[PDB]
Amino acid sequence: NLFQFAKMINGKLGAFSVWNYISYGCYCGWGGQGTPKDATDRCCFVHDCCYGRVRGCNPKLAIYAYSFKKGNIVCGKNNGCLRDICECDRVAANCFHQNQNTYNKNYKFLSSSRCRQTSEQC
Amino acid sequence: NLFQFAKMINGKLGAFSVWNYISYGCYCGWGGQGTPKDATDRCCFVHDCCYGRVRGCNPKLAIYAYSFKKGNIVCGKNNGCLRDICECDRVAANCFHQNQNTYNKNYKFLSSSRCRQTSEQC
Amino acid sequence: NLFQFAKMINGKLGAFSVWNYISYGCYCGWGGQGTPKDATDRCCFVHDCCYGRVRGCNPKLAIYAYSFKKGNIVCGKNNGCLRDICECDRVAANCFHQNQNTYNKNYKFLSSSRCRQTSEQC
Amino acid sequence: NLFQFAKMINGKLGAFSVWNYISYGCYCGWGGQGTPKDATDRCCFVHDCCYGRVRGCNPKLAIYAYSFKKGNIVCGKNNGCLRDICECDRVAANCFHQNQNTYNKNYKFLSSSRCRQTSEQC
Amino acid sequence: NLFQFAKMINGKLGAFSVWNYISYGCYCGWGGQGTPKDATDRCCFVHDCCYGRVRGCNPKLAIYAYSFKKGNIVCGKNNGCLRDICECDRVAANCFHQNQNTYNKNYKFLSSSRCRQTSEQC
Amino acid sequence: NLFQFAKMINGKLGAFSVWNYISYGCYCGWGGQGTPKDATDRCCFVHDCCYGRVRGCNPKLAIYAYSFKKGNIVCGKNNGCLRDICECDRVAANCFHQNQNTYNKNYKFLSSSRCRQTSEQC
Numbered sequence A, B, C, D, E, F: 001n002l003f004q005f006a007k008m009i010n011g012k013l014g015a016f017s018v019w020n021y022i023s024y025g026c027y028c029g030w031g032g033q034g035t036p037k038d039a040t041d042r043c044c045f046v047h048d049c050c051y052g053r054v055r056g057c058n059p060k061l062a063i064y065a066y067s068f069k070k071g072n073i074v075c076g077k078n079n080g081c082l083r084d085i086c087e088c089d090r091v092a093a094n095c096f097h098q099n100q101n102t103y104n105k106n107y108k109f110l111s112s113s114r115c116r117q118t119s120e121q122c
């Protein structure tokens, strides 16, 4: 569930951190095209693709099981797609945290003209 | 008027049904690209194209005349574009109802990466 | 800042005028592709590109200095990107006003199928 | 829950009818004081009272079982609070339908100055 | 209607000014009780009273005729309720302009605890 | 400001916790009258009172300095009103944490009929 994904992100970077990834670069947020603008943006490209490969369930609506163990995300008893979905978010959340140090505020709500490049394939 | 279109859909499938078609597949909702994912999604592709061919009026803002006769949509006294607009929505609404049995919840809020295919032309 | 841009537009065309440019043609609003549908729409294409060329700052979040002198927008003490950003909005706002006489309501919330053309380059 | 209440209303009066009751008279909607303006308003006063008597569950959030039978609302196999909640909703929706011909559009978004009278106890 | 009221305010005070009056003091905005905090607040109390006296039409929804003449608001050829509504709005907007220099930003989103005093009758 | 208040709450109780207090009991959220339903509600009554005593600044908008130290909230070097505001928020957030085990989900979106009792002075 997207709410859970936001939960992981905020649990990893702090309250409201999810908002730093709503419309960032060319792939973080609604839709996605062109080429990733940086590490953080690539995290979203990867996440988008991870979702694209899920079948049998809805990655943004399906509810899975997970938890935090000493500040680290932990996908619990999951089978099939649910397992895949949790894995998609867990990896994306850690990827944001891992690349926090290079987050470029100038990429927030990036201009449409800057993602006109060819859409890298999954 | 989009409110009227939502009226037809809800009148044909039930209260709030319109929300099942707000962001479904690759063409049901804001924007549209790639190739239709199913019958329901093709209904939206057709609807989008039907609008694209309307001239002289705004398909999403223009108000037309219509009504329900024994559970069936009926475009009334319409001339020119208004006639075309009502026809676009009427057909789309019946198309959703006609294909209700194959509606795939997994297509709601479909990942951007799954509509990367070539944009079928109208 | 986008709020400032809306300020210029409304200051030039009247209260709430900004809403006439939120989703107009193929480039006025969120995202932008295909070919401009008219003068007004080209104003937005130009504006989008003007933003795309800004570096070092966020064109939609950065706050610059400006004012109205006898009904005319005036970018004040600005240096670097801020200067560029204000210039982008000032030009766009005047461009809307300049082409008000050809504004086509039928272009508001234009169908996705009507911007399928090749995306003109900046 | 409130969504089910809305479906009851819409199922009895037509798509979007619930909106006719979001801010009507002195009681239809958030808060409520003063003299009811008509039968519809009286029923909103009662609906709130009915919710106020519920214990052990959240009337606006709890999900109960119900359905439509030949156009009439039927509360399903509910026990305890869920049964009371479904009833509150059923009675309120039937009342709106019952009094649809006296519904006065002039009471929509009523000024607070017309709801200052003393308030009756539930 | 309220949109026209907003244009009056913005036309007199500048773009987005209406927002300065959405939740100000004890009366500018939904509900209202207690002692007005200043002239601006007093005028909001009156505006609500003025709407409350209207009969035969919905003050917040009804559309009347008006225009600006040399910076001043002029209510057009309105009869019955529409004339009263336009007046309520005109007087309120002129009052906000009249008292713009005493407008106190500290009264924006005022705590409810400061609006408990007895309330004056319209 | 309110955003800082939300971060305090979320930092003490977890992501999105602030939402548990947007419309809870008779005082947690807009308006407030009647008898508090529990300790949490009592603290909301006080929080509003605390804001109501502030002068010279807008409690909901003013930005103060604060931080977290070993899980505890610390108000920074604030003078005048900013110090009082930070305190109002700190005390309220700590109270919600203190009483999280008595938090009753049945009081979320409480019916107005349960908040009619006389109201205590601040």
Ligand SMILES: COCCOCCOCCOc1ccc(C(C)(C)CC(C)(C)C)cc1
Residues within 6 Å of the ligand: A002, A003, A005, A006, A018, A019, A021, A022, A027, A028, A029, A030, A031, A032, A044, A045, A047, A048, B112
């Ligand atoms: C190409 O697109 C790929 C998506 O990019 C991945 C990055 O996503 C970060 C933002 O994701 C969310 C999370 C939650 C939400 C909702 C609306 C569910 C909740 C909210 C408003 C509390 C953040 C929306 C977007």
Ligand SMILES: COCCOCCOCCOc1ccc(C(C)(C)CC(C)(C)C)cc1
Residues within 6 Å of the ligand: B002, B003, B005, B006, B018, B019, B021, B022, B027, B028, B029, B030, B031, B032, B044, B045, B047, B048, C112
């Ligand atoms: C490529 O895009 C083609 C559009 O897809 C067609 C399917 O449309 C279904 C949803 O359409 C609506 C209908 C109404 C609305 C509004 C916002 C007017 C009303 C609302 C919120 C009550 C549903 C929005 C979208």
Ligand SMILES: COCCOCCOCCOc1ccc(C(C)(C)CC(C)(C)C)cc1
Residues within 6 Å of the ligand: A112, C002, C003, C005, C006, C018, C019, C021, C022, C027, C028, C029, C030, C031, C032, C044, C045, C047, C048
């Ligand atoms: C390709 O896209 C280019 C953008 O098109 C340029 C035209 O922009 C006109 C509309 O721009 C705005 C201005 C302000 C706003 C916000 C949300 C900041 C404020 C609001 C709601 C008050 C209008 C949104 C869009």
Ligand SMILES: COCCOCCOCCOc1ccc(C(C)(C)CC(C)(C)C)cc1
Residues within 6 Å of the ligand: D002, D003, D005, D006, D018, D019, D021, D022, D027, D028, D029, D030, D031, D044, D045, D047, D048
């Ligand atoms: C607080 O209510 C006091 C009593 O009034 C009873 C009349 O209620 C009218 C219907 O109320 C609502 C309000 C909101 C909604 C939500 C927000 C859940 C859904 C929506 C937007 C689809 C209408 C549903 C029903």
Ligand SMILES: COCCOCCOCCOc1ccc(C(C)(C)CC(C)(C)C)cc1
Residues within 6 Å of the ligand: E002, E003, E005, E006, E018, E019, E021, E022, E027, E028, E029, E030, E031, E044, E045, E047, E048
């Ligand atoms: C309920 O009012 C009590 C009396 O207060 C009078 C002061 O009113 C201030 C302006 O009020 C509004 C509120 C909302 C609006 C809407 C939502 C219609 C439009 C918007 C969002 C563009 C401001 C317009 C004017």
Ligand SMILES: COCCOCCOCCOc1ccc(C(C)(C)CC(C)(C)C)cc1
Residues within 6 Å of the ligand: F002, F003, F005, F006, F018, F019, F021, F022, F027, F028, F029, F030, F031, F044, F045, F047, F048
């Ligand atoms: C009016 O308050 C009366 C006293 O109640 C105190 C409890 O307050 C709970 C938290 O209140 C809010 C409300 C809104 C918000 C905003 C809208 C600023 C931010 C949001 C949406 C992220 C929660 C923050 C905190």
Ligand SMILES: [Ca+2]
Residues within 6 Å of the ligand: B010, B014, B015, B016, B017, D010, D014, D015, D016, D017
């Ligand atoms: Ca409906």
Ligand SMILES: [Ca+2]
Residues within 6 Å of the ligand: D042, D043, D046
């Ligand atoms: Ca009754």
Ligand SMILES: [Ca+2]
Residues within 6 Å of the ligand: C010, C014, C015, C016, C017, E010, E014, E015, E016, E017
């Ligand atoms: Ca304006």
Ligand SMILES: [Ca+2]
Residues within 6 Å of the ligand: E042, E043, E046
């Ligand atoms: Ca007065």
Ligand SMILES: [Ca+2]
Residues within 6 Å of the ligand: A010, A014, A015, A016, A017, F010, F014, F015, F016, F017
């Ligand atoms: Ca959070």
Ligand SMILES: [Ca+2]
Residues within 6 Å of the ligand: F042, F043, F046
């Ligand atoms: Ca206390």
